[PDB]
């Protein structure tokens, strides 16, 4: 579970990198699609699922929007992301094993763009935060 | 495994522009901070951690030089870490991710998705050889 | 991989006393109930689930017959489930556990730790071949 | 998270199998030791770490005692197993990846002994319960 130190770290980091959220989302989705090809099937209904495509750039905004929501609902991720969990489990039917994949790509992207700010201390807290986000999204699966 | 000429070039390029004394220590340090339970086998300023960090990259170097025999190149180390050191296998994957994140910070935008892919495949191959 | 004569005998014994029409359906049914997200690819009384359940054991049978070539014996199926069916690889491990739990219930005390070990190694080998 | 249906299922199942907890613990530890050899190192200080040994039988009682505690503290596993988490993380320094291993052996053992009662419905609830137990034990690691 996230400690107050963890919540402060995530809010402080988000405060710094949030401005580039559109770029982070686009880059993170691009990588997941290229590095982990099995995820492609979920976006097969899009005409262009290549890096930097208009569909991916657009979705990257929505994904980072979910992360920003998680940061604001940091004190209770289960309740905060309930609708997203229901959506991924029932409407989208996204295999829950993929959440950990995207989380990793998000960390890589943040690392490539904010090397100075993405310290190991910001990393442990963000990693715990993303695990909580993944756990919250998995809530409605069973 | 099946390597493409492109993968061989990328991996070769990554290693030739990688400063082991910089990447090794940073990757291991990060791992001990992000996954604290690996601290038991031994943070930023600890020379011993730095030393082993360098050794890890040098160990990867060996596999980069003979990419076709990755499995047999790690027999001595697989047994050392396993039988002697008793490192839980799951920890190889944790370090691998930290190495990836540290390299990403150094390379910045040059660490493209394609570069990440080749590198992750390379590390996946090494990790398997270590848990072999 | 490296199989011992004992492992070959155990695995051979397990398969010769296993009723595929009983184990197959039960293992798949359990998997769809315990890990509901695998229901998407298709609970107790569904003939289609029962059918594929039987096919899984028959697929294992093939690997039991040629334990030395486990990797190459699943090329056709690895591609089917992957490229055509789009089954996420993590699900192979989920089914494997259900097969183990169902077999354990049938064998009772005869499902010793040693028997479990050989069987899990066998399934681990098949799972890898499927994600290959 | 566990639903009321999940809590009822675990309490009902525990009500039925609890009587054989000593046997379940001994069998589950035996299997983990034999099937997953890397776990042996944690019990190296015992003279006899072979199946059915006096040390393993004894410990199997303590492990099942922890499970019974978890069942009684089912409404809040984090608070209920805090001391055990601290113990495994700091005093024992048990790698958290092993919790999922023991959980699997527990399921196998229960299946070999109570095939009639260990239905798939009891299985999903117990599996969710054991994941919560593992998650609670991992609480103090970082
Ligand atoms: C861990 C972070 C995740 C977050 C925060 C997240 C967030 C979201 C959000 C906000 C939406 C938009 C829903 C709407 O507009 O109503 C969405 C849609 C979707 N998500 Fe996720 N998601 C996550 C992980 C994943 C993963 C790992 C996959 C699959 C590999 C996935 C696949 C999808 C798909 C296929 C859609 C619909 C795409 C479309 O048709 O436009 N999501 N997600
Ligand atoms: C994934 C790549 C890994 C490689 C390639 C690697 C490589 C090495 C090498 C070259 C040595 C020196 C052995 C000798 O003296 O001949 C060593 C030692 C050791 N490794 Fe690793 N290692 C790896 C992972 C790990 C992990 C995950 C841990 C756990 C945190 C770890 C803990 C140790 C310890 C404690 C020693 C012994 C003391 C020392 O000489 O530093 N190693 N490793
Ligand atoms: C781990 C062992 C597995 C084996 C050995 C196996 C074997 C098979 C076989 C023999 C077929 C028939 C293919 C044909 O018609 O020629 C098949 C089909 C299929 N498998 Fe599997 N399978 C495995 C895992 C999975 C998993 C995890 C899922 C996901 C729940 C799954 C979903 C399907 C589906 C939907 C079909 C196509 C429809 C059908 O013919 O039943 N399989 N599998
Ligand atoms: C998931 C269920 C787990 C529970 C409920 C549990 C519970 C306990 C309890 C109650 C104790 C006794 C502590 C005392 O007497 O004060 C204990 C000790 C211990 N546990 Fe666990 N444990 C769990 C998992 C594990 C795992 C997976 C490992 C390692 C592979 C582990 C290794 C140990 C060790 C080494 C001790 C001390 C043994 C001794 O010196 O007697 N535990 N555990």
Curated annotation (Swiss-Prot), chains A, D:
SUPFAM superfamilies: Globin-like
GO molecular function (one): oxygen binding
GO biological process, one term: hydrogen peroxide catabolic process
Binding, heme b: 88
Tissues in which the UniProt entry reports expression: Red blood cells.
Residue(s) carrying N-acetylserine: 1
A GO CC term assigned to this protein in UniProt: haptoglobin-hemoglobin complex
Keyword Metal-binding set for record: yes
Alphabetical UniProt keywords: Acetylation, Heme, Iron, Metal-binding, Oxygen transport, Transport
Superkingdom per UniProt: Eukaryota
One Pfam family from the record: Globin
Family statement drawn from the similarity comment of this UniProt entry: Belongs to the globin family.
Subunit text: Hb1 is a heterotetramer of two alpha-1 chains and two beta chains. HbC is a heterotetramer of two alpha-1 chains and two beta-C chains.
Further details from the record: This fish has three hemoglobins: Hb1 (major, about 65-70% of the total), Hb2 (about 5% of the total) and HbC (about 20-25% of the total). Hb1 and Hb2 display a very weak Bohr effect and no Root effect.
Protein name, entry field: Hemoglobin subunit alpha-1
Organism, scientific name: Trematomus newnesi (Dusky notothen)
From Swiss-Prot, chains B, C:
InterPro entries listed in its UniProt record: Globin, Globin-like_sf, Globin/Proto, Hemoglobin_b, Hemoglobin_oxygen_transport
GO CC, any one term: blood microparticle
Any Gene Ontology biological process: hydrogen peroxide catabolic process
Record keywords, A-Z: Heme, Iron, Metal-binding, Oxygen transport, Transport
Superkingdom field: Eukaryota
Residues that span the membrane, as ranges: none
Record's subunit section: Hb1 is a heterotetramer of two alpha-1 chains and two beta chains. Hb2 is a heterotetramer of two alpha-2 chains and two beta chains.
Other known facts: This fish has three hemoglobins: Hb1 (major, about 65-70% of the total), Hb2 (about 5% of the total) and HbC (about 20-25% of the total). Hb1 and Hb2 display a very weak Bohr effect and no Root effect.
Protein name stated in the entry: Hemoglobin subunit beta-1/2
């Amino acid at each position: 579970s996230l400690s107050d130190k963890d919540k402060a770290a995530v809010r402080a980091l988000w405060s710094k990198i949030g401005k580039s959220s559109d770029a982070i989302g686009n880059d993170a989705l691009s990588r997941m699609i290229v590095v982990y090809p099995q995820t492609k099937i979920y976006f097969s209904h899009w005409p262009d699922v290549t890096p930097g495509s208009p569909n991916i750039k657009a979705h990257g905004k929505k994904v980072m929007g979910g992360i920003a929501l998680a940061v604001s609902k940091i004190d209770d991720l289960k309740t905060g992301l309930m609708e997203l969990s229901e959506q991924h489990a029932y409407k989208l039917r996204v295999d829950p094993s993929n959440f950990k994949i995207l989380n990793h790509c998000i960390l890589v992207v943040i690392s490539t763009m904010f090397p100075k700010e993405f310290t190991p201390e910001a990393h442990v807290s963000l990693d715990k935060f993303l695990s909580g986000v993944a756990l919250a999204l998995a809530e409605r699966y069973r | 495994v099946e390597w493409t000429d492109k993968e061989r070039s990328i991996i070769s390029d990554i290693f030739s522009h990688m400063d082991y004394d910089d990447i090794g220590p940073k990757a291991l340090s990060r791992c001990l901070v992000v996954y604290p339970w690996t601290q038991r086998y031994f943070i930023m300023s600890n020379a011993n951690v730095a030393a082993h960090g360098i050794k890890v990259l040098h160990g990867l170097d060996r596999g980069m030089k003979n990419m076709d025999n990755i499995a047999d190149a790690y027999t001595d180390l697989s047994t050392l870490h396993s039988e002697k050191l008793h490192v839980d296998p799951d920890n190889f994957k944790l370090l691998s991710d930290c190495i990836t994140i540290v390299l990403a910070a150094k390379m910045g935008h040059a660490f493209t998705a394609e570069t990440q892919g080749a590198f992750q495949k390379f590390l996946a191959a090494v990790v398997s050889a270590l848990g072999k």
